[PDB]
Symmetry: D2
Subunit: 315 residues, 4 copies
């Protein structure tokens, strides 16, 4: 009887990020939500909590919990946070590759036409692992990391310039850790190069460097401060912004881990790069004219990913 | 911001509910946020996470942490979730939480006495009374969040059964916490149409309604049971923030909450969950429903519970 | 957009209401928009203006104009405002608008037969019937916008008197156009609480309620009188788009509108304004209220009006 | 009794733009609205229409109409669209200077602490006229034009690159007409220079020039097409976005007509420039490092304004 069905997003992993992405769907009435996890009780508790929030938000989406993959059938988007968060993130490889392969089998069987956003660390490597195991088209698989990294880069710059982060364009590309690459040269204030602001003394080169470093250390700082767990509010919104850009065919520039077949001279691997997300999934991969120095920094990020993928293959 | 400053909301208690209310402020660009807690470290971590979310939401509010009451100065609204959640029965938390609530009251009284205060700390109705007495704030500027959450549950369950958005289900719970809370079955409507008309047309049975009333009472406990640790926070955070927004934007929304009684329902000098209108004047109206003799009997049980807890509160 | 395409809404008629519904789609990023009109030039101008607004709203939907029905192919919803607004009594527009509505029906039947259709063209109830008969579309996929707007007025007036947000005022108008429209005084509630309780507590008098009922009936005419040219469009556009969104997002909202009757209220094979639930299945429920004998008498007057207009419609 | 009062915006001019800005306030629950105009009936009809929309939007703001300035007392923001729209916009000068001076007297008397956004043409000249007559601080007076011009510039670029306009930073500065200056060199896609996209052939220099020209002619095209009146949907949102940035102290980069005391070597005049709008009104005026060629184009815009102000003084 239903002619116009709601979009459906399956959260594979119902931890803090998963439950929070479910909350965002309720607040924005973005889609029905399935909180999936191989955990007893907890996912149902969060589904009841999120479901009950629809009343106060005056929205109507269905939030349910599941532990069997058949329940993710028909999902338009799948967001994966399942996997270990601690035992180096590189060290998570063996344990999470196994989990990601199980998720890939579930998606391949029940919702192979979905757009998939991986969050599981080590991210770039796990995205490749999911892509290989699931068999999905390269434009329908990506990883969330750089949107979150860029959010931090932007917030720090916005604080210094006293301008809303909406008007700060700052992008981080590459992989996780200290090799991530906050592109200082491409930071703009509504398209106006940051270098002009530095020249006017609105920000010093030293402050910029401090911000670049802070962007790299941001996730670890939150981990240290929380004492248990890791960030979830910004990560959840980062992933849902990518999901909405796909669902509503918005065509948003959102840096994320995408499959390369020549871009930046890279082949057969996923790495964080500026991309356009729309109803066709990853519709564009933007290849920046990196300077020689930037390429050298980027190569280190690339090498980190290549090394992990080498180890992944050895499994 | 020399002329127009942003509203400011201090979250006294930076646990799951506090951090999530901060998140809502970021998403809606509702107000600058202060995540306050006696515990140091964790609030600063959540403040960093919530502030970083402003970039993705394309909003601009400030989110900071604090462990000093001086930092809540200038707050337009204060939402208190501080307090023990278990004894080292919510009624038993009285001793421990009354002390914490009194410390919070001292902080608010001194640093932001003109704030609208929403208490969440259990045992709720008793703690609202405790805060009001210790803070000396105007009776219309102090209330407690509970019934909006209880009603959200009542509404969601009814919405699911009738296949209608909860926006269009008006269902209200009044009273205190526990099995004595009172889901008002007679006042449930579908866009103003009495639920009884739907039951008569077979869209729901009286048995199902009774089941829904009972599920409403047990809902919080079910989530506690299922999460395994802690309690609900997504709907509670949105319930409190919806009350805060109604005040900040002078919306004049009907939101049942723990309010000071000066004759309504024959009650005096106490707070209890009742339908109320929240606007820029704080609690602008306390709605007095024409309860049947049977509903009055059930309500009296909540009254008795609160009155007894308050007697102990005084005895401190 | 190879996998997930945006919803699409065709505005058949690009006058003030049509251009404004397009604006709402841009603001909410609800859907791509086609501003259709037999008149060329003006729709393209409004499409440029509405599309340029996407930049400032930071949204991304396509807004284009058209004068060929082929361009409405793929529409999920079609909202029709086309038709004369005055004879070169709305009842008298029948001849002229029936012809236009039939042409629109032919266009929809051929190019987007699976669309959910919201008719706005006067005389409304008769034109909905005309469209349904000419288009052959399923009865649950055709409706008319009028009562949501009439109810918005009823609610705003009540909200002003009680000093409560209209979000919390449930007030409904049913029936047809004109003085016969029926604002249901007995079913007005404040968050499900009967208005009678508020009147009894002195928050409003029966005289004021009667005044509000009359103002609700005269509201459209007052705006026509005051604007000097044309009629209301901001609230009408939002009323129609709210109905469209309920369908697109399968919200299941209670929105009174002109719906096909198959026994409800004892009516058959005709459309008339009634409380209904709009979801992804189109008109999912037609709510049958337990009207008193007096309300039935008033309602019968609307029924008689529609039945008489439909007799003439047939006689064409 | 009310401790937390709603913001209040007075629309001086209740034509299509005024009524539409009132609608936006209702939809966003941004502020109470006063639809002011020295017209009988019409403003009240629009106030009833906009007021009735609050019910469907489930919001609560008060929308009233007025014809006496005392009714704008206490306004936080004042948006002025009053004045003739036709008889060259330069030719409107004599008629609109008189109207703007009357509005300035009303604001100076009843809400001198308001943030004022002028829309009345010829814009840059009328903003100066209002500032001089009202006596308000230079940071509290500005004119809306460039946000609308930039919206067009951005939409056209977004269409060509298949990217949401959210991610297109394109700015127009200067005055109205063909002398407005769409800054082609500062157009970015999330901070990435447009020149890189042109190099990749995603857009040709010819298409860019066509877009620059189209941006200049956009308002006139709508006028031609509508047959009567001029654009109002994008203009209304442009002005309300500036008003909200002030009310919520957002610190948004919004190009608008602002007072210069040295910026770009300009003195004692208002002209469209990139600015940051926050709770302090115009908090920053961004001085771009314009190239010699850009300065030459800008000088023509400046000369147009200077000529009008010369004529304004001669009144």
């Amino acid at each position: 009887g239903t002619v116009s069905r709601r979009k459906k997003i399956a959260m594979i992993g119902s931890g803090m990020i998963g439950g929070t992405m479910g909350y965002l769907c309720v607040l924005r009435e973005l889609a029905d939500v399935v909180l999936f996890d191989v955990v007893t009780g907890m996912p149902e508790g969060k589904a009841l909590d999120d479901s009950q929030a629809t009343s106060i938000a005056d929205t109507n989406v269905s939030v349910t919990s599941a532990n069997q993959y058949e329940k993710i059938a028909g999902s338009d988007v799948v967001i994966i946070t399942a996997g270990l968060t601690k035992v180096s993130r590189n060290d998570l490889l063996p344990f999470n590759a196994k989990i990601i392969r199980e998720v890939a089998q579930g998606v391949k069987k029940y919702c192979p036409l979905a757009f998939v956003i991986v969050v599981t660390n080590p991210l770039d490597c796990m995205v490749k692992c999911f892509h290989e195991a699931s068999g999905l088209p390269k434009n329908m698989v990506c990883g969330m990391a750089n949107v979150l990294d860029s959010a931090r880069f932007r917030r720090f710059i916005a604080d210094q310039l006293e301008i809303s982060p909406r008007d700060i364009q700052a992008t981080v590309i590459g992989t996780h850790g200290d090799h991530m690459l906050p592109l200082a040269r491409y930071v703009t204030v509504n398209g106006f190069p940051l270098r002009e602001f530095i020249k006017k003394g609105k920000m010093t080169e030293a402050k910029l460097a401090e911000i670049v470093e802070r962007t790299k250390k941001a996730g670890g700082e939150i981990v240290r401060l929380l004492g248990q767990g890791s960030a979830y509010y910004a990560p959840a919104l980062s992933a849902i912004t990518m999901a909405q850009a796909f669902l509503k065919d918005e065509k948003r520039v959102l840096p994320c881990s995408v499959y390369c077949q020549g871009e930046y001279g890279l082949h057969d691997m996923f790495i964080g790069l500026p991309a356009v997300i729309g109803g066709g999934g990853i519709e564009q991969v933007i290849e920046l004219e990196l300077t020689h120095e930037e390429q050298e920094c980027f190569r280190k990020s690339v090498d980190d990913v290549v090394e992990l993928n080498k180890s992944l293959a050895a499994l």
